[model samples]
Every structure is written in C-alpha cells, then in structure tokens.
Target: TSKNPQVDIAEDNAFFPSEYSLSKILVIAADERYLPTDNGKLFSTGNHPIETLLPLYHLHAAGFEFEVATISGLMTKFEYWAMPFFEQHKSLFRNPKKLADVVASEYAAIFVPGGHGALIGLPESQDVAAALQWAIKNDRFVISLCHGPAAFLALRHGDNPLNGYSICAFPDAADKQTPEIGYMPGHLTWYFGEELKKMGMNIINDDITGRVHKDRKLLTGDSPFAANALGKLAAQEMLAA
Candidate 1:
C-alpha cells in the first residue's frame, strides 16, 4: 500500500548449537564482479548465498572457526539477486584473507562456494592451485558446491591431482534453469559440469536436491538446493577427522 510496494519477504532461520570444539576451515571466494567470456562482454556474476553462508553457519554452530580467502583479499561482488539474501551475514566478508596467505595445512578443510565468479576467476589463480595441491598431498578435505568445483581448473597439469576425482557441478541440462540475467545461453559462460568433464573429472548428477557425493577427501554438490546436506556432511567429516 505504499509508493513502492514490495512482494514477499525472504527469511531463513539458522540454528547453531554451542557444544563443539575449535577447528579451522578455509573458505575461498572469487573476487570478480563480472565473469569474462570469449564473447567480449563481462556478464554480471554472483555466488549462491546459501552455498557459502549456509556451510559457514553450520560450521560455526559446530564450534569450528573459519577464515575467508579470496583471489585479492578485496570485497567480492555478489550476484545482485543473491545480495539481499545475505544481508544479515555481510560481516563474514569484512576482511577476508588473500590467496597468498591461505595456509592449507593450518585448516582441516578448504571450501569453495559456487558462483559464476568462480568459473572465471578461480581457473586463473596460481595460489588456488598451490592450496589445493597442499590439501591433496596432506590428505585434507576439499569441499565445493555447484560451480565451486571450477576452482579445480587452477591445479597444475604435470600430474593432474583431480584427473580421476568425482565431482557434481551445475550440469548443462540445468544451465537453462539458471536465471538468465538478460543474456542468452551461448553468450553466457560455459556449463560447469561439462567443462569439468573435459578435464577428466568424473561428473555425477542425481538431479536431486541436497544430493552430495563424496569421493575420498573431495566432496561436491550440484547446487545451492544441496547446501544443507552438503554442509552437514562436511561438518561431520571434519569432526571425525
């Protein structure tokens, strides 16, 4: 009934229990605001709010500490549509660490949350590769959701660490369902799961919400709908480790 009437308000109730011990986890985010395509235009990008924040909430409730790292330590530009969903949790990005400062061994696990930003920014980071290498060498857990698996593109090629690993990324069949944000399919970035498959990673998709697949120390989910299960599984694995 006002000048600018609003629709339904979106709210999420997060629950955190207070009986766990302290274990550190590294959270990586892509710093790009626009994803670059060979087509020459930068497509606006953002991570799924639930993919990163939900896991952080779950981990925090379990008494685990988190350190957020990005390609440049600067503020990340989230997809406009996903911003309001994270209004109350903006503090998480206050002062994220830079990739150079990310020490894999100090953390029990490394998590890369999904966003179109990861597809463009993560593949080009040497620091990201180094961190993943360390995690694999040390047998530490590496978890990612949706497009987050694109970070694997950064790993060196001499002996591909993820050559045979299993992953569940946003599949091409599901790409059309993603919000277009005003761009056509070909003009947008490549399909995540298809791209990963090209690199030899086994991509699994059950087309189920909250479906998470774990292969060794690596775990991944297809989309934000899987956030709850993915986060719970990651916390359980970390706690057991």
Candidate 2:
C-alpha cells in the first residue's frame, strides 16, 4: 500500500529443511531487460529480481541442489527496484558459469520466475527453449512463477508434444494503486495469454489471486504474495519425483 512499489510486505518463510537427497535442479532465468523503465537506461535487470529467490530458497531448504542459466548464457539481471534485495542477499542463488556442464544435464526440475523484464529474456532465446524441450522430453519437472511462464511461449509453440499441455501463469494484474500511466493490462497477462493462444496451449487455471494448475507439470503463482503456497507445492512436486 505504500508509495514504494518495489518494497513488499515481508511474509513468514515457512521453509523446512528436507532430509531428502538433493536433486540436481536447473534454473532458466530471464534477462534483466524485463525491468520497469521510463527511458530504458538499463538500470535494473528484470522487474522482479527477487521473485525466484523465495521459491528457490524454499526449494534449497527442501534439499534440492540447484544451478541457474540465462538466455545467451548471460548473467541474470534484476530489476532496478529489486537490486536492493540482490545486493543484500547475494549468496542465496547458485551463480554457475554459462554453458556449464552441470546445467545441461537432465535436471530433476526446472523453475522459472517472472518479471516484466522477462520480456527481453524469453522472446529472444533459443537455448532456453531447447532446455525446456529437453526437460519435457526427459519428463523432468517444469514449473514457473508469475511472468516466468512467458519464457516458454516459443519453445512450446512448435510441434512440441507439450504444446497442448495445460498450464498456469501470472495473470495480468496491473498496479491499480499507482498513478503510473500506461496501457497496463495486469502487467504480463495480455502478452502471455496471446502467446499461449498462438502456441495452441490451454490455460487450465485463470484465477488472479492464489495458485493455479494445469495437470501435474505446470504450476503457477499469481504474485509474490502467494510465495508460501507456491513454494510448498513446488517442493512437494519435487519430492514426489
């Protein structure tokens, strides 16, 4: 409710350390270009830089080993606002090298988080799509948060078997409270919805507040506010595998 859009209310982290053996997990991150901008000075990397951290921190606690890669094998960028968090908590994520030997393997699961900055990341990647295709082929787990689902728009578009797979996404939820002027259609929803349509995929869950699902492979959360619910479900899915 405050004027600072980047600042979010702190929520209780319900993560529980898992005794389960850590699964080799891989993360595909969108570039920082998804950040909110006025003149595009390239200040922030992505809109919600810390978006993936909460779910991932929870995942780490659940005993899953993880690695991350970005489109073009570039360093993951955070939105300008989210810079505060990343600078403060640098050690939470796994910063592996590009084209690293570990990430190319059949991962236990692949997690994608969202931000408007993902726009630059997803639409431009062939490798990211390849990674997704690999995951589906291997029957490895595939999960995304918020706009992170957009990263798959093209990869799932071709004759890929998962093209028709059911999925959930960060529905366009505009910041109505802010006086910022733009054709805000719930932020990332309109673009993602349109992309999914072009790809011929079905949206099983369309709710704006809470978690939505499509069968067992695709899991989506509407926003950071839903992290607790989303992380638990993601970890459970990992444990089941």
Candidate 3:
C-alpha cells in the first residue's frame, strides 16, 4: 500500500486472448491540478481516481499496451485514491510524451480520463484538437468519460468533427451542487458539456448513473459511476472480432 499511496488493489481481473499485435492505446491526459472557478479562485481538484484508473485496468488486463501523453509532458496530478498497480505499471506513467508530439495513427484508440482538471487546459488546446481530428479521420476509437469529454472542445477550429454525435459527460447540474457540499471551492467558470453541444455534440444523460454510451467509434460515460463499465466496454469493443 505504501508504494501506491492511498490507492487500492484489485486481485481479480479479466484478460482477453491476444487480439492485438503490438498495438497501443494513446492516453491523452490533462496535466493541471486545479480548476479555475468563476470567482477567479483555483479549486483543489484533479482527475477522479475511479474515472481514470478503472478503465485503465480493464484495458491493461485485456492485453492492450499503453503510452501516456499529456498536454505539457509533465506528470499529471490525479486526485488522491488513484493507482496501486503502478509498482509494476510505473513505466506507463513515467516519461510521458507531449500530446502535441504524438503521432495518432500509431494508436488503435485514444482515451482521456475525467476530472475537473480537464477544464483547465484540454478544452483550449489546439494540439488536442489536431489529435482528436486525427482519431476520427483515421476511423479509430475515442473514449472519454465525465469531464474528460470537455477535451472535445479542442476540436479543430473551422469545423466540428463530432457534430451530431452523442456522448455522456459530467453534468452541470451536479457541478452546481458540488460547491454546496464543499466538493468544489466555487462554481465553474464554464460548462464544457454545454460548449460541446454548441459544436453539435449531444449529451445524452442529464444525471450521472454509470451510463456508458457509444456513437460509432466514440465511447463515453457520465461520471466515475461509469468508469468500470466504460473500461469493460472499451476493452470488449476494441478487441471485438
């Protein structure tokens, strides 16, 4: 437990037959630790532990290789309670590639984990836009959950490639309530799902319920509640013959 800090380990996991031939999943994660609130204060927030790690476990056990990339090529700040398997998986988190430097076609799918941290830089990143652009252009899978879908705002300017596609994301309704319970320091400066809708992406769930959705190659879920199922779906779908 000391090696993983506050995280827990799962002894039982499922593994699929070798469906991949050295293919890897490109994980584009947000690097920031705090979310800028509407009141101009930084909230102590980060990627959700379940949202990030659960799906990762499913994919890993499915025999998929992983390489992480972040916007800044810096260590990603995940909230407490994230990983315990890193003792053996430490290599996956270290020496991340810069998202901008990534070559998209080399990966079979692109995944981004959820947290309020996603709102900090991912949505505004043009580099993220290009990679997101490449995913669809090449007919590869894209998976994200909760606020992770916020990164879709980075869709290449001048066109919304995800237009008309449906997805599930963290709800503004919940974000509105978090501050009342001290989960947030203040209200968010913006609602990413609303902005995504402006680009014509449909948000199918009004509340969080571990709901996972698929719109062709794009797979998304509502919140941390959805992480495990999303992971299972991602592993099953990506490996489907």
Q: Which candidate is the best by TM-score?
A: 3
Q: Among these predicted structures, which one has the highest lDDT?
A: 3
Candidate closer to the true structure by lDDT (higher is better), 2 or 3? 3
lDDT of 2: 0.57
Q: What TM-score does candidate 1 get on C-alpha atoms?
A: 0.79
Query: Which residue pairs show backbone clashes in model 3?
Result: none
> Which portions of model 3 show Cα errors greater than 4 Å?
1-23, 81-83, 103-105
lDDT of 2 at 204: 55
Candidate 2 matches the true fold with a TM-score of 0.71
Winner of 1 and 2 under TM-score: 1
Residue ranges of candidate 2 with Cα displaced over 4 Å: 1-23, 34-47, 80-94, 99-105, 173-190, 205-207
* Predicted candidate 1 versus true structure: per-residue lDDT over 72-111, tens digit per residue: 8887556544324256547666568788866543778888
Model 1: runs farther than 4 Å from truth? 1-23, 37-41, 83-89, 103-105, 176-186, 206-208
Per-model C-alpha RMSD: 9.2, 9.4, 10.0
Error of 1 at 207 (Å): 3.7
Whole-structure CA lDDT of model 1 = 0.69
Task: Tell me each candidate's TM-score.
Answer: 0.79, 0.71, 0.86
